[PDB]
Structure formats: structure tokens, C-alpha cells
Amino acid sequence: AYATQGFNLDDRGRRIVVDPVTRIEGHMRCEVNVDANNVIRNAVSTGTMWRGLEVILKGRDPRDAWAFVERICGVCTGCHALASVRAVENALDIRIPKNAHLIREIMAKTLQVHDHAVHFYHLHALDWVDVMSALKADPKRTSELQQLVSPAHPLSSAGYFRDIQNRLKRFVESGQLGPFMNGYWGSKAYVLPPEANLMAVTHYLEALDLQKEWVKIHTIFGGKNPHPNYLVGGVPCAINLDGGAASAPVNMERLSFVKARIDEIIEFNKNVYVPDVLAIGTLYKQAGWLYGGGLAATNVLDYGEYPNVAYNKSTDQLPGGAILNGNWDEVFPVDPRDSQQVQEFVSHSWYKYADESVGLHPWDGVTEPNYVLGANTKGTRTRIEQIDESAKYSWIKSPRWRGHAMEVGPLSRYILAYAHARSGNKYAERPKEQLEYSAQMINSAIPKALGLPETQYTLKQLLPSTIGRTLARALESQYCGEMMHSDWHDLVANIRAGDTATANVDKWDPATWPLQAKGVGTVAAPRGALGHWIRIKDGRIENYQCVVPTTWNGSPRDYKGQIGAFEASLMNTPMVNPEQPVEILRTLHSFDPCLACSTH
């Protein structure tokens, strides 16, 4: 047992294993120890996959890299491609044209919305929503709840909710429960009334049908979703309003189609997703379930993203930096080029360095596998019963910022935005407004509407919690839909003014390149701070290192024994039943773990 970061870790209690962790992307094992009262007093994050993309890239053409690294992940599809083209463009001093910038931003913001909304409904909701309780709901009371939660959502009739309920009934009564089989239904960890459960299940189904429309924005600009195409120097989707305009990738009709999809997104975020998260968050807040803050209460980081003037970072609409020790009055600048800032340790990871007492900046990064289990393992090399976290216990590296363990993600971006806004940064006004609105809804308006006591939680109290982490994701989805709505107008205006350029090809040919170069590309990816760091030599990739948001959040302990965001978030959480991982899943899922991303 030892203390770190204000957490008293203790592995003497009852050991619980969750393997596989489901409703995530990829492969994770989680172990915890619980005390005599079922409170988690130790947590262990194990990434259970590795593919070695960084190794595979060596010797290849930098222009091809985006397609390889895009296949790090099909859920956060394209964010790696974006990071890669940015890194190569940074290395080779390539400035992309305005339309390429705007198209990439629209693609990025489309991914944010799709990834966030699908995460919440299809991966996260079942940690909050009891689908069997939905079968008991009264359709009229569900209609009434819907009208209170979101007055503008037109799918609100008792008959509509009755029809959905009856389909669920028929499904369950078949005896083939499918994705609901062996669930934790009826646990006291579930607190929603039947009507709220039926509303949420209805929206699960609505979101499942609608999510396929949103990605058609990727399809127009990038050819396909998942895995749209990108390009070093711009975008491939050449523009022609009049000229073979029907055969051109982008004409006015295609742009009108994109706007129609954006407008639908704005309605979904405002009428379905945000109100559901506010309502569910309010009810779990009322139940007192404010666990899961972890490192969000102290240390958060993002690179900063979405400059309303291209290549001018002071205009980032999600402004980044680092906060330490819960001091929201001081945001430190984060520089991905600084060898003393972002570093990765492998002390507790299945890799090898020459010297594992130091962390490597990713321009100097090394990925040599070393799968070996500790002396205190229960089981064998190929049949693990209890992993030994005192030794190497994960395929995830341990990123740190100036040695500090940080949480990344939408919550981090929203805390950073709030801090920036309070210091006078006008570019963060919208997230500040959303947070203040959300706090008023959760504390006063929703309780009033539901006949519950009004509360007086501050943003300092509400945000560093599993509820807060889930809220920030929904707010971010809304904000990204709003931003790309503006980006669309800017794109169309620029094209109509006579700038139709989509690619800078001045340095497409490697005969124009410097014989060596290094570059970095960062992205505010859906789960947090993404970076790709490249070294180029003689036209080829010399080194390519990725540090991915779930690498930060899911990281194992560092050389100093400091815990990462997942492990910290599970600490000090009571479980209703230690053999039912409801609370573990609820909190882990609030980070939206992408394990393929984390390990690459």
C-alpha cells in the first residue's frame, strides 16, 4: 500500500477482475481491490492489445502514413489521419489552402458529434438506464416526462412511447435478450424511474437510426465512413460549382446536402442528447452519485483546437493548456515540441527502454515490446488470474506532462475553456455559457420541474465527477455542431468569392523535400489530446510516435508510481455488489475508452 496524488492505494482488500471490459472499443482488463464496505481502494488499468503501428510505419512514405495511422481506430475514424497530415505538413512547411482547412474542420466536428452521441447512447447509457425497468413505464407519464425534459423534441406522444415499449416487450419475451443478456438489471445502482428508462431506450433506438446520416458529411468530403480519405497538402475533394461540375467531388448540390446534415445534427444535440444527459445527470446527482472525479479535480490537459483564424493558436475555440492542483486561475501553456513537457514512461508497460527511469518525448520515442509478468502474478504467462501491478501490466505507455499525471478529454477541454473564459478569453464564451446553463438546469430548473429539492453545487463540485465527465461530452457535441454550421458558411462564402483551391502541391514530390525534417501534428480528438510526432529522412519515415488520448487516460503507473486518470477515477467508489461491475463500467465508460487507440 502507498499514497500518491492524494490517493491512499491499498491492495489488501478483496480482488475483483473485469475481463473483458465491454462497451468500449478494443480490449481492456480492469482489476480493483475493495474494502470491508465494498469501496474501491485500488484500481489497475490493463490494455490487453497491441498491433505496433509505430514499428510498421518505419521506412514508408510520409504521404502514405495517414492511411496506416487512420486504421489505429475505426471509432475515432479520421482523427489520426488529420494528426498525420498535420505532422507531415509541419515537418515539410506546407500551408494548406483555406478550403482544405475548413473541410478538415467540418470533418473533425462531424466525428466529434457522431463519436460522442453514439458513445453516450450505445456504449454508456446502459450504465445509467435499466432497460427492464422501461417495460414497467407508463406511456402517458413517459410522454409527460419527454415534454418536461425537452419541449421542442417532436417525438413525444404516448402512442409513440407505447409502440417502442411494445417492441421492447416482444423482444424481451422472446427469451433471446441479445445485447441485454445477463445484464445487471434491477441493481440498486440504477436509480431512474421507469419513464426515464423508457425515454432513454427510445432515444437509443432513435440515435441508432440517425447516426448513419450524420457521417454522410465524411462520405461527401472523404469518400466513405468509416475511414475517409485525407491528403498531405489539402483535401482530395476538388471543388467545381459550374465548369464537369456534376463529376466534381464538391459542387453546390453536395455542399447543400452537407448543410442539411449539419442542421439535423444541431436539432439532435439540442433536443435529444443534451437534455437527456442533463436529466439523467440531475437524477443521479439527487441520488448523491458524485463519484469518479479522479484527476479531473486536479490535473487536466488539452493541446487546444479549432482556431477561428487558421494557424493562429490564440484564437482556439477550445483553448488548451494544462491546469495543475485544481487551480483554475492558472493555465500553463502546453508545447508539443518541448522535450521536457510530453514524455512517455514504460516502467509499468510491456515495452523496453535502455533506461526505464526516464520518460521519452515522442520525437525520441521507442516501441520495443516486452511482454513479461511480475513475480506476484496469480496464474501463468498465458492464463492470468490476477495481474501484478507492481511490475509491467499493460500494453499502454505512460504519458506525463512535465512529470505530472493528467486527465484528457471533453471534460478537460471544458474545465480549460471555463478557466480561459474566466481569465478574459472571449473565444471560450460559448462553452462557459453551456456550463453555466447546465449547472442551473441540474441544480434548479430540472429539480423544480420534477418536484425534487433544488441544490447548490458549484461547477468546481459538479464537473470533477463521472456525471460531469458525461455532461462535458454532450456539451462538446453540441458546440462542435454549432461550430461546423459556421464553418460551412465560411467555406461556401470563400468558394463563391472565387477561391476554389483545395490542395497545395508545391511540396508533393519528395525531390522538393529537405533531406531530413521533423514535425508534430496535434488534434483535439473526441477522447482528448492526440499527437503524432514524425522524423523524416531521405524521403522515408525514420520515427513515427503516437500519443493518443486513451494512452493518457488509461495509462499504467509511471516510474514514480503515479496513477493515471482511469485508476484515479475508480478510487473511493462504493459498489452495491462487488461481483457486479456496474459502477466500474459507469466510470470507465465516462472516459469513452478506446483501447486500440491507446496502444496502436
Binding site: 475505426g74 450505445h122 445485447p179 468509416p226 492464463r383 492470468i384 508533393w508
Partner: protein, 269 residues
């Protein structure tokens, strides 16, 4: 009773699962609620850990030789199989266990079919396609990174309707979706036939939708339904949106040179 599907995930990026849920005809919602019983799937399932693991046993017993095993991703043979760990054991052990009593095995995507990105040189994990590990069961390969949504649901729909695997080509792919090269019906083919090519990104030729052969398009050597069925309810495909096919449904496409290097011997196409 709806046919159980046990959908396993090896080393993968999850693109095939995401593509499946884009299907418009049929809706994935209708597939899950009314066509199959999706009893195990790490992506969507309520149960975790021991409760998730227990489902496999139950379905295998109750529906022995009458469930479909769908596999996304692939098993690694290096690191003693523990570069992909499930329930503390190598994925390859789960794969072999569930495969034994399946009535059919679907290899979703290029990972399961051939290896995909993790199997590109130097293949640090010795990631290996399903058919090299499971050699005594009927397999259908549905390659692509990912495959088209309606191709995935089209395969399922055929299998459920007929209780048969559709006719396969020599490589194990369904002829109903993989009989044509992209280049056969590509709408830019008349430009190819007339020697009208893009030579630099965003040149005048690109703005007129000229053929992408000289920009590395691998459509002439790649079998898929992208030129006809197209992507995301027929909204576009890679070539329509201006990037050459990178060959993503073909075996070993990551190690056939740069995506931007043209095929040699243009006269053969």
C-alpha cells in the same frame, strides 16, 4: 427463434462494427431486434467480465452447430498470443473454442480475412487471418477496410434467409458483392478510356473528375462493390470524392507500394 450470432473481436480497429451500423437496407436496428440474436459482442453488450464470458458457454450448448461466429480482427501468434488478451488468455484460444461448434464463420473485413494493417511489414505481432488458424470450418471472407455497410448486412441477410453461405470465389469472397473490379463500372472509366487523367492534386483535370490512375488508383486490381453500391447509402465512394482506390479489399494491400504510385502497364487495364 432468431439465429444467434457470437461476434468476436481480435486485434482490430473496430471499423467493421462501425460500418455494420451504417446499413440503411436493412437497418442494423432491425437486424439486431428482428433478424439475428446478437448474444456476444464486446462493442454493445450489457454484460462484462464473468457475466459476458458465461454467455458464450450458454449459447454454444443450447445452439450447438446452429450459431454464426462472426470475427472482426485477428489473432497474434507472437508474444505467446498475449498481444491480444481476453479473460486473461490469448484471443486465439477464445477463437478456436467458439469456432468449433459454429455452423458458419464470417471473417469481417480485411483484418479477419487477410491481416490488414497490423500484418503489414514487419508484422510485429504475427497477426494471422482467421482461415490460417481455423482450417476445418466453412468460412466466408468479407474483405475491405471496412467493407461497405450493405455488403456486411447483405451477407447476413443472405445467410439468414437461406441458411447457406452464398457462392464464393477462389479467395472465399461472396461473388454477389466481389465479382467486379472497381475499374469495371467506375463512373470515371470514360476518362480513363480517353486518356484523361489527374496529374497533380487539384489540377484542372481533378476539378473535372478525370481518372485517378496516375495518382495511384488501385481500382483496376481491386474487387469490391464501391463503384456501384457505393458508400453510406450510395452517397459517394473514394474515387467520386477524389482519392484513388488504395486497394483496401485486396490481400496485402499495405505492402504493394505507395498508395500514390501508379500501377505499371496501363494497357492491361
Amino acid at each position: 427463434p432468431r439465429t444467434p450470432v457470437l461476434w468476436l473481436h481480435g486485434l482490430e480497429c473496430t471499423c467493421c462494427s462501425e460500418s455494420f451500423i451504417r446499413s440503411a437496407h436493412p437497418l442494423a436496428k432491425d437486424v439486431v431486434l428482428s433478424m439475428i440474436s446478437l448474444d456476444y459482442d464486446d462493442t454493445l453488450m450489457a454484460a462484462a467480465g464473468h457475466q459476458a464470458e458465461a454467455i458464450l458457454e450458454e449459447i454454444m450448448t443450447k445452439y450447438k452447430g446452429n450459431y454464426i461466429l462472426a470475427v472482426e480482427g485477428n489473432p497474434p501468434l507472437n508474444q505467446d498470443g498475449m498481444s491480444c488478451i481476453i479473460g486473461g488468455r490469448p484471443f486465439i484460444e477464445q477463437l478456436k473454442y467458439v469456432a468449433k461448434d459454429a455452423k458458419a464463420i464470417i471473417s469481417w473485413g480485411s483484418c479477419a480475412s487477410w491481416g490488414c494493417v497490423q500484418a503489414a511489414k514487419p508484422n510485429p505481432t504475427q497477426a494471422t487471418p482467421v482461415h490460417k488458424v481455423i482450417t476445418d470450418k466453412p468460412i466466408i471472407k468479407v474483405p475491405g477496410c471496412p467493407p461497405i455497410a450493405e455488403v456486411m448486412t447483405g451477407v447476413i441477410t443472405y445467410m439468414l434467409t437461406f441458411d447457406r453461405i452464398p457462392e464464393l470465389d477462389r479467395q472465399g469472397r461472396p461473388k454477389m458483392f466481389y465479382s467486379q473490379r472497381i475499374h469495371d463500372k467506375c463512373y470515371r472509366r470514360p476518362h480513363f478510356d480517353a486518356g484523361q487523367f489527374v496529374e497533380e492534386w487539384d489540377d484542372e483535370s481533378a476539378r473535372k473528375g478525370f481518372c485517378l490512375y496516375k495518382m495511384g488508383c488501385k481500382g483496376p486490381t481491386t474487387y469490391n462493390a464501391c463503384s456501384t453500391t457505393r458508400w453510406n447509402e450510395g452517397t459517394s465512394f473514394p474515387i467520386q470524392s477524389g482519392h484513388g482506390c488504395i486497394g483496401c479489399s485486396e490481400d496485402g494491400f499495405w505492402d504493394k507500394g505507395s498508395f500514390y504510385d501508379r500501377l505499371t502497364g496501363i494497357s492491361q487495364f
